[PDB]
Subunit: 262 residues, 4 copies
């Protein structure tokens, strides 16, 4: 399927590892030029070298930026514009809340809202005039199924994820006549560094092994397997495509059937 | 129907006018003692005199407090405890976001999150240990249908409302074994001072009359009428009751059929 | 709370036992006159005697009827109308690799049960309620079951939208685990099993028919005058626990 | 993007025109062999010739069948299996005061259409797909219509849960306003009417069959290997505009 992405410019946030890195690879494969970013310079340079060596025909700009920070996010967009003169695609991908409700303080909630929640809203606001001006844009938000059905070990995430799903609908409605399409994808369980970190921290809290936490997860997923970042990236790349030109304002679970199992 | 509310202590926030005032009246009618509050002292004293004269057999504590503010909210709960020694019911009711997305700044969003969103979360956190300790509690959050299906003239509200609906489910799950039940009610269009203020500000933005804005609203509601605060309060009072002892974690539209019309 | 139900006439289907029986009790307590019905004439007679003794001032009509049959349902409505001259409230309450071995005939049979049963009775009472400008309809809602229930939830919304201008309000309630005869029977054909179910309910307790009935009676009241087209889970928090 | 569809066998129902026809084209373009079907033999012959000429290297079986009839649907599946030895993909695509005047017979007739039609064809292909450990089923989903569509959305979830361990994935797509023959016909029996519909669509444009088909082909691909049980609106933003 020709996805019409040749020479499009994609900004993928949080793209030195996990879901974000594989999305960057797959967009480069379809002919996009990239902007990649992350907080840790060493990890970012490793990712940059991997992508540059794999897709030497594509332009790739790597920038150290914390996209929870206003200054870094504003400067990321300006650097991107200085390099490419346009941004066609934005993938919003950044870290959510950390791993009883009465015990969470105001500060705890405020740090949550000042992370991924305003992070995605801010970068959306920053790219909208760019994409509107050219009557072509795609924004894909990487959210999480907890926004739809919350999980006990994920309370703050669920609140943030619900908010972002609602935001997605409101902005989609406003930007639709400009051919600026905005969607979200809710990962189920996808095998990334963060997922494997979740396996360690909860095996300890629960006094068990990563393997047993994983067997318990696998029993909940109809497919009886944890998704790969490639499987996840395929949908994101489709939504970022010319082929997805009538799809906007929706949130799609990518979860091995987890939502059918609720 | 005996609702089992005699001598229960109810805190109704934002209760000097509109939905909140009528909820206070109806809870007093069923035999509760009250705490009422608001920001404007003059408006609050008028409400206090109205309720005290109508329900002289009930105790009523009135306090000036902005329940978007941490200090005022903490002190409201301590004052309530000093007066009554317990809080049985909390009705979360406070002002939402004010009347294009790219144009909203970080500060604008942050003020939103520091209003009703953290306001309801904070007061929930403050009352939970009180209600848990006595294995009896009810929290009813007054949200808004925009959390379910957002409206163009209500973007920031929708984001906040979605978040709060998700929060409601997560906290309900955790507090259920303590007989501390938490639900939300999503008003449609209910005839309050704020609603009538909405009619003025949008008749001006649109160059028309309040009457015509109202006729346009009425065509969207299946019942062909705007709800009264009494109709709205009936459900809240039911949810705050002993009769609602198996209902928790849900959000109920109270909207004249507006949700069936989406 | 004054529910405004004195002298209202309520038809509660499946009311000889369980959830339907306790809904009938609570409606009588609020001042309704009743029609109660069921297939098991003996269970229905027991129910009727219990209600008549507890509520000697209320009128109670009992009718043997299978509300999955057209002719029975038509005559149930005609018989109720003849007795009372009005029907104010209807509570619809009737009984509801693996998937690819369900035949055409299997699926047709489930559609001819509770699905068309609730639709048909709704249709039969709507003219009467529209004439009155007063009505309340409350619908008590594996693979087959889920399909029927999704269908009925959507039917509830569609009808509510159309009938709202006549003050004929229709809503649905979705029970979690409620201590009914089916439930106590459903345990034994499968505490032990109970202890596993309790672990899945956040409240850690099975609901009572009384707890369930309270909500149905609210929705059937004058106090619910601005509530229509909605489906409410009454489930001890199951729906907050995916 | 390589969809992994070379030599996969796809049955697309209602494929002589409109959405089904363009889905068949796009599948052939990705390397599938096809079964196309329809009731109107003349329209079906036109479709078949168009496809055979555009995709001379692909196999295309055309069968006249009414996929709301049991016997036609059984023979459609048997005939496809005989020709190809496998069925990898099924796309279910067939035709779908007011409420209280819908009779029992009216409702029974709608349930015997698209509702049981999609369920029956699903059931008929599931053994074949489970044998293969490879399948994709995509379901193209007033009062009657909404009831059927809610039922089918829920059916999609239930079947997806059961068949996921066999790599038989099932999803649904809900079109908004798509420029099909029914649509251009549906205008005239009621631009003018078009200009009012366009005002309701945030994108301010009616979708093309090509735009719709692209998503169906994605969902039917190897690339959608972790996606099952979901329903996706393809609607130019209608669903973000209540
Ligand atoms: N994996 C899963 O199963 C699930 C994932 N998700 C969501 O998916 C998204 C991706 O998660 P996942 O791939 O597992 O995470 P990983 O931690 O495996 O990868 C995250 C990547 O993003 C970078 N990153 C994180 N936060 C920021 C930031 N503020 N600024 C810049 N770079 C950042 C990280 O680099 P560095 O640390 O150097 O910045 C790293 O490159 C997240 O939004 C997460 O909440 C949700 C549900 C389930
Ligand atoms: N009316 C409707 O149709 C709708 C209402 N809602 C929601 O319902 C709730 C009630 O709205 P409504 O009755 O129309 O509002 P009104 O403005 O008519 O009444 C609000 C009352 O609450 C008080 N109040 C507001 N904010 C605060 C605060 N931070 N601290 C203390 N008191 C406060 C006001 O007094 P003072 O100003 O003196 O503090 C007043 O007594 C709100 O959460 C609103 O978002 C949502 C959708 C539709
Ligand atoms: N209990 C639960 O937790 C759940 C219940 N539900 C739904 O709740 C409703 C009531 O369930 P519950 O009380 O547990 O069931 P029970 O079997 O305990 O009680 C059913 C009552 O309805 C009557 N009844 C059943 N079918 C018919 C019929 N076709 N015509 C006339 N009367 C009938 C029975 O009498 P007779 O046998 O004499 O006709 C009996 O009086 C049903 O709609 C069910 O599908 C759904 C999910 C969970
Ligand atoms: N177009 C839209 O915007 C919307 C569409 N839908 C759904 O989308 C799907 C396709 O719609 P669309 O292309 O607009 O419809 P069209 O009528 O334009 O095309 C329908 C195609 O399906 C065939 N068909 C219909 N019924 C049967 C049957 N029982 N057996 C065999 N073939 C059949 C027709 O051929 P023949 O007549 O020869 O059998 C024709 O090839 C349907 O499932 C519809 O309900 C839902 C909502 C909106």
């Amino acid at each position: 399927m020709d996805l019409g992405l040749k020479d499009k410019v994609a900004l993928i946030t949080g793209s030195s590892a996990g879901i974000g890195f594989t999305i960057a690879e797959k967009l480069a494969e379809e002919g996009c030029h990239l902007i990649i970013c992350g907080r840790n310079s060493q990890r970012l340079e490793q990712a940059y070298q991997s992508l540059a060596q794999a897709y030497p025909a594509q332009q790739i700009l790597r920038l150290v930026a914390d996209v929870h920070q206003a200054q870094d996010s504003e400067q990321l967009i300006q650097d991107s514009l200085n390099q490419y003169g346009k941004i066609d695609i934005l993938v919003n991908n950044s870290e959510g809340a950390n791993f009883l409700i009465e015990n969470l303080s105001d500060e705890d909630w405020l740090n949550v809202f000042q992370g991924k929640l305003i992070g995605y809203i801010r970068l959306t606001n920053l790219v909208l005039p760019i994409m509107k001006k050219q009557h072509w844009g795609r924004i894909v938000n990487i959210i999480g199924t907890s926004g739809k059905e919350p999980s006990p070990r994920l309370v703050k995430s669920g609140v943030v994820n619900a908010a972002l799903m609602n935001f997605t609908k409101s902005v989609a409605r406003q930007t639709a006549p400009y051919n600026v399409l905005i969607n979200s994808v809710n990962p189920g369980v996808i095998d990334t560094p963060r997922h494997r970190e979740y396996l360690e921290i909860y095996a300890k809290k629960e006094g068990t092994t990563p393997d047993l936490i994983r067997e318990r997860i696998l029993k909940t997923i109809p497919m009886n397997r944890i998704g790969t970042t490639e499987e996840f990236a395929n949908l994101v790349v489709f939504l970022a495509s010319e082929c997805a030109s009538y799809i906007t304002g929706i949130t799609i679970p990518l979860d091995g059937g987890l939502s059918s199992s609720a």
